[PDB]
Amino acid sequence: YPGEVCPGMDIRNNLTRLHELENCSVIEGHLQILLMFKTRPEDFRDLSFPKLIMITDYLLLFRVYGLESLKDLFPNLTVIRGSRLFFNYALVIFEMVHLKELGLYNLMNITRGSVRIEKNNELCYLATIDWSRILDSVEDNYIVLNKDNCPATFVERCWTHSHCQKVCPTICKSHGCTAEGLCCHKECLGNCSEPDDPTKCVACRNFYLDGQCVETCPPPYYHFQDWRCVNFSFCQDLHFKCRNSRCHQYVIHNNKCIPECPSGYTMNSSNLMCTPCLGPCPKVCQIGEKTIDSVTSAQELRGCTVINGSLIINIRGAAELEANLGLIEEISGFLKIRRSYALVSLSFFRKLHLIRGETLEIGNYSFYALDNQNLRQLWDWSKHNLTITQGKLFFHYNPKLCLSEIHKMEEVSGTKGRQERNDIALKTNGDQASCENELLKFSFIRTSFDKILLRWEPYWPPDFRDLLGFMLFYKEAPYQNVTEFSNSWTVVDIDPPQRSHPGWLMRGLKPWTQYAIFVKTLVTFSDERRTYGAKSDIIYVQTDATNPSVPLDPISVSNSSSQIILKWKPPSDPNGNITHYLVYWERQAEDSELFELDYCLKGLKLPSRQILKELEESSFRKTFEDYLHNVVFVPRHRPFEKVVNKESLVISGLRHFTGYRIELQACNQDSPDERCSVAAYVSARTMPEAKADDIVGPVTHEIFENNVVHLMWQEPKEPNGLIVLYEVSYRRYGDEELHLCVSRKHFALERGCRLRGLSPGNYSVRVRATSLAGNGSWTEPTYFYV
Amino acid sequence: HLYPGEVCPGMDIRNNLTRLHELENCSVIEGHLQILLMFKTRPEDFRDLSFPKLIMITDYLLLFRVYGLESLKDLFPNLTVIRGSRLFFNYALVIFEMVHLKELGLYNLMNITRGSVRIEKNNELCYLATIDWSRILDSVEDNYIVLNKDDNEECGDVCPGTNCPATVINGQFVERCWTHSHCQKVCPTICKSHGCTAEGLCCHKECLGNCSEPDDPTKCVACRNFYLDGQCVETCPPPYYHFQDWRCVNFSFCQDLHFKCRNSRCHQYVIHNNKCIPECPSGYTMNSSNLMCTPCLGPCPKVCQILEGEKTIDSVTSAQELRGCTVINGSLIINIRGGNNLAAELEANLGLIEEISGFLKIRRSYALVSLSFFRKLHLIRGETLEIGNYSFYALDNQNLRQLWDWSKHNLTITQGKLFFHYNPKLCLSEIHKMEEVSGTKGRQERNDIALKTNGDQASCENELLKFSFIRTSFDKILLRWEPYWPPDFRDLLGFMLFYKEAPYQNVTEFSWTVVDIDPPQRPSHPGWLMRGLKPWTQYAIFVKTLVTFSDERRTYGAKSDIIYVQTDATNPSVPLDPISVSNSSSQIILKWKPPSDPNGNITHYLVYWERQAEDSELFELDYCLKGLKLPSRTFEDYLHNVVFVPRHRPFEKVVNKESLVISGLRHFTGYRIELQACNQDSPDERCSVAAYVSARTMPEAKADDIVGPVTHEIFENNVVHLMWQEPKEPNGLIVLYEVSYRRYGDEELHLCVSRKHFALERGCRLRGLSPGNYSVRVRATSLAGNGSWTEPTYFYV
Amino acid sequence: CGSHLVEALYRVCGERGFFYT
Amino acid sequence: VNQHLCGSHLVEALYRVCGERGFFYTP
Amino acid sequence: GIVEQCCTSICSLYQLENYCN
Amino acid sequence: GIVEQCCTSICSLYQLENYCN
């Protein structure tokens, strides 16, 4: 195939970059035509690239001045593979001026994607282009704000005034039709030099190789961006091209020269195979020097695990700094920190293990710490692992960083003698870091569900007055990995004891909860800042349990006339390990007032169902105290259940349409006198039986000699709850169905009914009992002659 | 009155009461009495002892660790005023570590000339806050009274009000009571210091507090200025000389005093300016015969040598011994751990000095503001250099603004090195100005001056910044200022935007949200647009410029002033508390609170209303069948960002009102009402959101009642149809007519006439009626309730 | 913005070029 | 017992040492 | 970027000149 | 002074009667 591969590119501000497409046949990527401001129609009526045939990704046209008809630019563009769809679009047309007609009749098919054509004040032939024949995905088009011999698919499809939209036969779906309209090769598409010939194909349906069109890439020629075939060496070279240039470090995965190894797969030093590696083993990110100034300064640093450079962080400012960072384990260069104001500690570097420091900060300092105010802790060197390959240590102007911390990096990083004198400024660092930390030991602990009582050793500096007071640092410890540090650390002051241990207790605690506790002291440092403090190691306490909470959302449904299924939620407050559930249920009596209501009347409706300013005063008192001393002295039951490992339940063996009371409780204890929560109450009624209200039983009538009939029938003694009344329909030969109501009292005292003075003839008897579920069944006709 | 007794100098009492007899005839003490070392002392050891003779103390009073004592009135109940000539650590009276002491009883004391009182660790004393110090002390701020009985308990007090005076402490009256037996005497405001007699007849201008005969210097209990022969005198007439600020003495006395020290170990006094001065200042020497020290014909300064050349100054009494000094043969260190200023006495005792043999050091002092009190310090040789070869030392100084007015103060230092550390409010400009004024620029090595600590919270940019562009908007505000550039561009690191809401104009300098701005490229106006500003709200803004340390250079940056900007107004919040209650069949009272967020001052309120209509189903539903219960009432973004990369209802206007009542409203009918509040009405009205609310007037009592007569028609089949018109003007409407027709001497039949029954059937028809007289009453039950029953329709069929 | 901003940017440019990556 | 006695503890220590004789002062 | 700098907010001439070569 | 003697340094029992009569 004669031409160059034409990587995707864009042209701006003039026609000068247009000349670079002269020797182009197939675009491998995407072209963008835009910013043609200093451009005229004449400068482009005399320019074309007939050699150009294929474009891989898309084309972009936006704000181009001068171009009048695009048939001139691209007389031989046939297929846009749509491999990369710009804004999920295979073609974008926006803000077009000087342009009148489309002119690209040579485009017949698009593999995938859609086209957006917007802001075309002077576009023509808007309704004369067949989109469905070209676009396999037509509903995503956005064609708005526009000026709006050959077959009609009925409007004729024409691109220009002279040549129209070529309509290959539908049999040539993707083969392409030749000049006379014959299906070309399957690898051919649109048009072909010779019909049915991969060697003479203008276009390659799936892949290209050696002037010929193939569907797949055979080895050693690997798939190349889903459009052509290449062996390993050239793909290596471009991969190695990225090695010694700015890039797309190429890799071959699935025998495809994709720029990127897929997830969990990693580069091999020998071959380009993206070998497996659990979660992408590493993530080195090149720079070699970049400062970190804010959150966004670490945007590309997300997921980086190794830095082939050095970092100079200066954050002139919470946990957001941890999520960005801490993914990194090794850094080839040095680390420099300076005046990061709001940096209390460097905890958020979780993964920091090794530092090459081969590139050395001036003074050969693999580390540089300066103007660090709030920096109180580097890392828990008792557990964290860190080592420096080489370099020196700079630690200056860090008034709130204890020297003991400094004493730990050389013993952790193996830099014991690498430094020299003044590498650490003994006086600029930890001036306000009081870390004498006289170990403090708790004397006694008493615990409860809410009130825990402490007691600790009473400690004394050489002057008892020096002690300002105690304060207890406490906060719930879900885990065991808790260190002091903008920080919550709930803490309460304690006045020094009068001179037994001081001790203290707390309130408002949550039973069955772990807490982390440590204690420090307050002493006014001497004239030489010899604070000589005392500190308690952090301790963890877990309070006991209590009565739990009610299980939540107790919901029960009558899935059957005998099945009652319950659902609920675990209690909001387990307050200890919940051993099981307490369930209590009971048949509920219905209302007895319905047993006296006579429903034959109106009422037929049926109810169904700061500090230092204090330190002045302390010093003030002793000073006055001391002065006089020098002056004065002269040296001459219910059905229940235990639901275990379940949040639902079913109760069966229940009568239909029966009211119930349901009681649910939670207990965090089973054998030894359970601590149980209070109950959750829901009322349950099953569905009624479908045969319980039907009047079952022979109907007996007694005609009296004076034309009186007495009604005797058997009601269904087990009704749906109960039967409100009996509806009776009696009809005589030639008459209509009269209606009769038999109340509960009417069937009680009359054992049926008493009908008197009936017209002579033969009647019918139909009685239906209405239970709470509703009407039952009408009785069978008891015809009687009067 | 005169003082019958001796001068009784100030002494000390220890370990037993044996020394007490020395108070036998002491009408007044000429000194300070110190009381302590009372261990084997019992309440019973005291009740028989009292010295009513004593009146006034020149220097001070000392009480410490005395056992058994419970009150002092039982000892010294005639104690009146404390001169405080000799302070004891800026205090004229200290009561420390008392046990058994419960009340003072010093109700006979009125004022104190000078000094303060500190009470502490006296855990049994009451009646403390029950005393107004302002009468008692010419200044109360310097008092220290903590850690005693009252402040850790709530011991009862007995104000002798059954009358004693009460004054406002903060906002409430308290009986200024000394004890149960005594209360703080209060003279009228006219007797500022001289006081009055018991009845208020105010004392003489020579009196102080107490006097027997009002307006009589010879009857002044306390001599306000001087004492002379039972006559308080503003000045000592000749030949009598002013003596210890309180009495007049002849020449014989002063000479005898001088002789006594002459032939003894000392204070051999002299005479100068009508005063028996111990030691006169520089420039004078006392002659051979007479005891006056004339201005000498030479430079003879009053040289104050120092014991071991090392001295600290920590309180007033540490310095009053330096009064009148000019030359110091030693070094000096300053350390006052107060919390209250002491510059007043500091300038009085100090400043008169000019030169120091040794060095000067400032350490741990807290309330000190400036070293201006060193009035005359010009040259310090600093021979005895401070350890480390230093002549100046400043350390842990919390309130130092300046050191001296370098516009006018002149200073010279000979040797040594300076020291400045942890001085959070003293910036380097002062240090540089001093060291250039000192002449010791090239004497201080590295670390002699700490850069970060000194004056960090201070701000001496000394350069103003101008806003090259200003703009406000809805919630965003754009500012641009001039690009400020030091000759060393690198010092600049950015500009700090401080903004905060400004309720008023009283806004402080230096809450207070901060924003960072990047340095501009080197037009280039850094500027800023700020976001998220609540509408119609004042804000205060200024900027600071960040520079490097600038130690070799003096790039002190610049700043901008406080600008009070408020945002604009907009649509207000929703009007609040809209209720709907009717007070009449045509009057409904409407109330509404103003919006929570007016977002600009509210012009007025917008309200609309209209009337609803009944449901059609209400016209076609049976009102007697069961169930009759009637209610009673982006591609552009992506494309452009990719393309370009950088190098009418009835209503009226409710104005200033939150309550509306509307008339002409249909009785018992619902109405739909909407409401708004408007903070902009005339210029394209801007209002709040519509506040829908509904109300229905209470039903009237007539509309439910039936109108017109009732007619009956009888057919030959004894069937009766009753004729009556419905009340076409009901309270909303009528659902049913209850027809109650009986028979004469028989029972009664009640009939249902719903709306459809009436309209369709022309009322109701009665079938199957045997002949007889009928009583037919009809009631039309409305949306309200029962109507009036119609009169019975008597007829026979 | 959008329709207008493109000419707003064009007028201040055109000869110097419009920057691109 | 040798300790940094200062404050009321110092004073009580002194009274433990002396008090049978009284604490010295200049006449 | 530029869109919100210019119409969501206001962009002056300095932005316009920075948004070209 | 004396405060320096006991609070700062350590006082030996010989040093105390020097303040006792």
Side-chain angles (χ1 to χ4, degrees), chain B residues 372-393:
Chain B
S372 62
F373 50 81
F374 283 140
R375 202 54 56 193
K376 301 279 181 290
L377 276 297
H378 292 81
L379 167 61
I380 315 298
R381 288 96 62 203
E383 298 194 3
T384 62
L385 281 189
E386 193 271 337
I387 179 67
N389 305 336
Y390 288 103
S391 185
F392 188 93
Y393 208 100

mmCIF file of all heavy atoms in Angstrom, chain B residues 372-393:
data_model
loop_
_atom_site.group_PDB
_atom_site.id
_atom_site.type_symbol
_atom_site.label_atom_id
_atom_site.label_comp_id
_atom_site.label_asym_id
_atom_site.label_seq_id
_atom_site.Cartn_x
_atom_site.Cartn_y
_atom_site.Cartn_z
ATOM 1 N N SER B 372 11.423 52.023 77.147
ATOM 2 C CA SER B 372 11.509 53.473 77.184
ATOM 3 C C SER B 372 11.842 53.981 78.579
ATOM 4 O O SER B 372 12.438 55.053 78.718
ATOM 5 C CB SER B 372 10.193 54.074 76.708
ATOM 6 O OG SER B 372 9.145 53.681 77.574
ATOM 7 N N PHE B 373 11.496 53.218 79.618
ATOM 8 C CA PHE B 373 11.701 53.681 80.987
ATOM 9 C C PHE B 373 13.162 53.953 81.298
ATOM 10 O O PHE B 373 13.456 54.685 82.248
ATOM 11 C CB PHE B 373 11.161 52.656 81.971
ATOM 12 C CG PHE B 373 11.647 51.277 81.706
ATOM 13 C CD1 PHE B 373 12.889 50.871 82.144
ATOM 14 C CD2 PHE B 373 10.869 50.387 81.000
ATOM 15 C CE1 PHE B 373 13.338 49.605 81.891
ATOM 16 C CE2 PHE B 373 11.315 49.119 80.747
ATOM 17 C CZ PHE B 373 12.550 48.727 81.191
ATOM 18 N N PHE B 374 14.083 53.369 80.539
ATOM 19 C CA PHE B 374 15.499 53.700 80.656
ATOM 20 C C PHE B 374 15.722 55.049 79.992
ATOM 21 O O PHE B 374 16.143 55.158 78.838
ATOM 22 C CB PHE B 374 16.353 52.620 80.032
ATOM 23 C CG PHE B 374 16.473 51.413 80.872
ATOM 24 C CD1 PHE B 374 16.439 50.161 80.311
ATOM 25 C CD2 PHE B 374 16.625 51.531 82.235
ATOM 26 C CE1 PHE B 374 16.559 49.046 81.097
ATOM 27 C CE2 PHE B 374 16.746 50.421 83.022
ATOM 28 C CZ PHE B 374 16.712 49.176 82.456
ATOM 29 N N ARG B 375 15.426 56.096 80.753
ATOM 30 C CA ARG B 375 15.359 57.428 80.177
ATOM 31 C C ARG B 375 16.720 57.899 79.684
ATOM 32 O O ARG B 375 16.833 58.429 78.574
ATOM 33 C CB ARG B 375 14.796 58.399 81.205
ATOM 34 C CG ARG B 375 14.198 59.623 80.584
ATOM 35 C CD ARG B 375 13.163 59.217 79.563
ATOM 36 N NE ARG B 375 12.134 58.364 80.143
ATOM 37 C CZ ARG B 375 11.261 57.668 79.432
ATOM 38 N NH1 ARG B 375 11.265 57.701 78.111
ATOM 39 N NH2 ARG B 375 10.364 56.916 80.061
ATOM 40 N N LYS B 376 17.767 57.700 80.480
ATOM 41 C CA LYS B 376 19.042 58.349 80.216
ATOM 42 C C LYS B 376 20.152 57.381 79.839
ATOM 43 O O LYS B 376 21.312 57.797 79.746
ATOM 44 C CB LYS B 376 19.473 59.166 81.433
ATOM 45 C CG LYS B 376 18.485 60.232 81.843
ATOM 46 C CD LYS B 376 18.634 61.478 81.001
ATOM 47 C CE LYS B 376 17.659 62.546 81.451
ATOM 48 N NZ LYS B 376 16.252 62.193 81.133
ATOM 49 N N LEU B 377 19.844 56.112 79.609
ATOM 50 C CA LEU B 377 20.893 55.153 79.286
ATOM 51 C C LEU B 377 21.459 55.471 77.913
ATOM 52 O O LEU B 377 20.766 55.337 76.900
ATOM 53 C CB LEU B 377 20.364 53.725 79.326
ATOM 54 C CG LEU B 377 20.334 53.084 80.705
ATOM 55 C CD1 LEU B 377 21.752 52.968 81.240
ATOM 56 C CD2 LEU B 377 19.434 53.841 81.663
ATOM 57 N N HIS B 378 22.712 55.902 77.873
ATOM 58 C CA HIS B 378 23.355 56.234 76.612
ATOM 59 C C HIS B 378 24.581 55.385 76.340
ATOM 60 O O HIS B 378 24.692 54.793 75.262
ATOM 61 C CB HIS B 378 23.722 57.719 76.602
ATOM 62 C CG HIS B 378 22.531 58.617 76.562
ATOM 63 N ND1 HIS B 378 21.798 58.928 77.685
ATOM 64 C CD2 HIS B 378 21.929 59.252 75.530
ATOM 65 C CE1 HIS B 378 20.800 59.725 77.349
ATOM 66 N NE2 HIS B 378 20.856 59.937 76.046
ATOM 67 N N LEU B 379 25.505 55.305 77.284
ATOM 68 C CA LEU B 379 26.720 54.533 77.104
ATOM 69 C C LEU B 379 26.737 53.400 78.109
ATOM 70 O O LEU B 379 26.511 53.622 79.299
ATOM 71 C CB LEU B 379 27.970 55.392 77.270
ATOM 72 C CG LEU B 379 29.254 54.566 77.397
ATOM 73 C CD1 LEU B 379 29.476 53.737 76.138
ATOM 74 C CD2 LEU B 379 30.462 55.444 77.674
ATOM 75 N N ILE B 380 26.988 52.192 77.626
ATOM 76 C CA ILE B 380 27.302 51.054 78.474
ATOM 77 C C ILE B 380 28.655 50.526 78.044
ATOM 78 O O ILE B 380 28.830 50.114 76.891
ATOM 79 C CB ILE B 380 26.246 49.951 78.378
ATOM 80 C CG1 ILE B 380 24.849 50.551 78.442
ATOM 81 C CG2 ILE B 380 26.470 48.939 79.468
ATOM 82 C CD1 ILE B 380 24.572 51.270 79.721
ATOM 83 N N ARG B 381 29.610 50.533 78.963
ATOM 84 C CA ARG B 381 30.897 49.950 78.630
ATOM 85 C C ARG B 381 30.801 48.436 78.616
ATOM 86 O O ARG B 381 31.428 47.778 77.780
ATOM 87 C CB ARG B 381 31.953 50.422 79.618
ATOM 88 C CG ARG B 381 32.328 51.867 79.427
ATOM 89 C CD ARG B 381 31.512 52.678 80.389
ATOM 90 N NE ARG B 381 31.835 52.277 81.750
ATOM 91 C CZ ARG B 381 31.041 52.456 82.794
ATOM 92 N NH1 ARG B 381 29.845 53.004 82.666
ATOM 93 N NH2 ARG B 381 31.450 52.059 83.994
ATOM 94 N N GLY B 382 30.004 47.876 79.519
ATOM 95 C CA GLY B 382 29.816 46.444 79.559
ATOM 96 C C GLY B 382 31.120 45.722 79.797
ATOM 97 O O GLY B 382 31.451 44.779 79.076
ATOM 98 N N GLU B 383 31.887 46.176 80.786
ATOM 99 C CA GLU B 383 33.164 45.534 81.069
ATOM 100 C C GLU B 383 32.974 44.061 81.402
ATOM 101 O O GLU B 383 33.588 43.187 80.781
ATOM 102 C CB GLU B 383 33.864 46.248 82.220
ATOM 103 C CG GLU B 383 34.195 47.689 81.946
ATOM 104 C CD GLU B 383 35.164 48.236 82.965
ATOM 105 O OE1 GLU B 383 35.598 47.454 83.836
ATOM 106 O OE2 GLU B 383 35.496 49.435 82.894
ATOM 107 N N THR B 384 32.106 43.764 82.361
ATOM 108 C CA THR B 384 31.851 42.380 82.744
ATOM 109 C C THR B 384 30.883 41.821 81.721
ATOM 110 O O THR B 384 29.667 41.924 81.863
ATOM 111 C CB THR B 384 31.288 42.291 84.153
ATOM 112 O OG1 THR B 384 30.032 42.977 84.207
ATOM 113 C CG2 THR B 384 32.251 42.921 85.137
ATOM 114 N N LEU B 385 31.433 41.243 80.662
ATOM 115 C CA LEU B 385 30.587 40.723 79.605
ATOM 116 C C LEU B 385 29.746 39.563 80.111
ATOM 117 O O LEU B 385 30.191 38.744 80.920
ATOM 118 C CB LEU B 385 31.420 40.278 78.409
ATOM 119 C CG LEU B 385 31.857 41.447 77.532
ATOM 120 C CD1 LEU B 385 32.482 40.952 76.237
ATOM 121 C CD2 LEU B 385 30.672 42.350 77.267
ATOM 122 N N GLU B 386 28.510 39.515 79.635
ATOM 123 C CA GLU B 386 27.639 38.397 79.944
ATOM 124 C C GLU B 386 28.251 37.121 79.386
ATOM 125 O O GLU B 386 28.918 37.133 78.346
ATOM 126 C CB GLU B 386 26.250 38.647 79.363
ATOM 127 C CG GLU B 386 25.175 37.715 79.855
ATOM 128 C CD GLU B 386 25.054 36.477 79.008
ATOM 129 O OE1 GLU B 386 25.470 36.517 77.834
ATOM 130 O OE2 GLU B 386 24.524 35.469 79.510
ATOM 131 N N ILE B 387 28.034 36.015 80.106
ATOM 132 C CA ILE B 387 28.719 34.764 79.806
ATOM 133 C C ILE B 387 28.574 34.442 78.330
ATOM 134 O O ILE B 387 27.483 34.539 77.758
ATOM 135 C CB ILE B 387 28.176 33.638 80.704
ATOM 136 C CG1 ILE B 387 28.862 32.313 80.383
ATOM 137 C CG2 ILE B 387 26.674 33.516 80.578
ATOM 138 C CD1 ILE B 387 30.319 32.291 80.748
ATOM 139 N N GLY B 388 29.685 34.088 77.698
ATOM 140 C CA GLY B 388 29.735 34.041 76.255
ATOM 141 C C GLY B 388 30.190 35.327 75.612
ATOM 142 O O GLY B 388 29.965 35.515 74.411
ATOM 143 N N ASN B 389 30.813 36.225 76.375
ATOM 144 C CA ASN B 389 31.323 37.493 75.861
ATOM 145 C C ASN B 389 30.188 38.329 75.268
ATOM 146 O O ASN B 389 30.195 38.706 74.097
ATOM 147 C CB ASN B 389 32.439 37.256 74.839
ATOM 148 C CG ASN B 389 33.560 36.402 75.395
ATOM 149 O OD1 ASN B 389 33.767 36.345 76.607
ATOM 150 N ND2 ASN B 389 34.286 35.728 74.514
ATOM 151 N N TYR B 390 29.205 38.615 76.114
ATOM 152 C CA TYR B 390 28.007 39.320 75.697
ATOM 153 C C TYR B 390 27.793 40.552 76.555
ATOM 154 O O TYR B 390 28.135 40.572 77.737
ATOM 155 C CB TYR B 390 26.780 38.432 75.799
ATOM 156 C CG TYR B 390 26.727 37.359 74.758
ATOM 157 C CD1 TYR B 390 27.050 36.051 75.067
ATOM 158 C CD2 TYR B 390 26.344 37.654 73.464
ATOM 159 C CE1 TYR B 390 26.998 35.069 74.116
ATOM 160 C CE2 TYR B 390 26.289 36.683 72.506
ATOM 161 C CZ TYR B 390 26.617 35.391 72.834
ATOM 162 O OH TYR B 390 26.561 34.417 71.870
ATOM 163 N N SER B 391 27.211 41.584 75.950
ATOM 164 C CA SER B 391 26.825 42.775 76.685
ATOM 165 C C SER B 391 25.327 43.012 76.721
ATOM 166 O O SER B 391 24.864 43.773 77.576
ATOM 167 C CB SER B 391 27.503 44.020 76.099
ATOM 168 O OG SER B 391 27.220 45.154 76.897
ATOM 169 N N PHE B 392 24.565 42.397 75.827
ATOM 170 C CA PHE B 392 23.116 42.476 75.848
ATOM 171 C C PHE B 392 22.525 41.088 75.693
ATOM 172 O O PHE B 392 23.053 40.256 74.952
ATOM 173 C CB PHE B 392 22.582 43.367 74.747
ATOM 174 C CG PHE B 392 21.118 43.628 74.856
ATOM 175 C CD1 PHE B 392 20.653 44.740 75.520
ATOM 176 C CD2 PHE B 392 20.204 42.751 74.303
ATOM 177 C CE1 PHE B 392 19.305 44.978 75.623
ATOM 178 C CE2 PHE B 392 18.858 42.980 74.408
ATOM 179 C CZ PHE B 392 18.405 44.096 75.066
ATOM 180 N N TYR B 393 21.408 40.855 76.374
ATOM 181 C CA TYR B 393 20.770 39.551 76.357
ATOM 182 C C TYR B 393 19.270 39.713 76.515
ATOM 183 O O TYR B 393 18.806 40.279 77.508
ATOM 184 C CB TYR B 393 21.319 38.674 77.476
ATOM 185 C CG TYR B 393 21.245 37.214 77.158
ATOM 186 C CD1 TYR B 393 22.361 36.533 76.710
ATOM 187 C CD2 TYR B 393 20.062 36.512 77.313
ATOM 188 C CE1 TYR B 393 22.303 35.198 76.417
ATOM 189 C CE2 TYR B 393 19.991 35.174 77.020
ATOM 190 C CZ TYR B 393 21.119 34.521 76.573
ATOM 191 O OH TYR B 393 21.063 33.183 76.278
#
